[model samples]
Target: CPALCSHSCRSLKLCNRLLPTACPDVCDDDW
Candidate 1:
């Protein structure tokens, strides 16, 4: 998890039924 991650930060991983982590907001906050 991070408040500022890369575009390659695996933001789309959470949609997986498997285990995942954080991103997106870190790339684009308050979105």
Candidate 2:
């Protein structure tokens, strides 16, 4: 997938389903 710096992460609150390697940068700590 096209992974950006968590602009996609920031778009949604569920960092748990996202990724540390592919999905995002500034991810939520809730996961």
Number of the predicted model whose lDDT against the real structure is largest: 2
**lDDT of model number 1:** 0.36
Prediction 2 TM-score vs. true:
0.18
Per-prediction TM-score: 0.14, 0.18
lDDT of 2 at 17: 50
Worst 10 residues of 2 by lDDT: 22-31
Model 1 scores a TM of 0.14
lDDT of 2 by residue, 1-31 (tens): 2445345655445542564445544444533
Question: How well is each residue in 1-31 modelled by candidate 1, as lDDT tens digits?
Answer: 4433343345534422132344323323322
25: Cα error in model 2, Å: 4.3
Residue-pair clashes per candidate: 0, 0
Backbone collision tally, model 2: 0
Q: List candidate 2 segments past 4 Å from native.
A: 1-17, 24-31
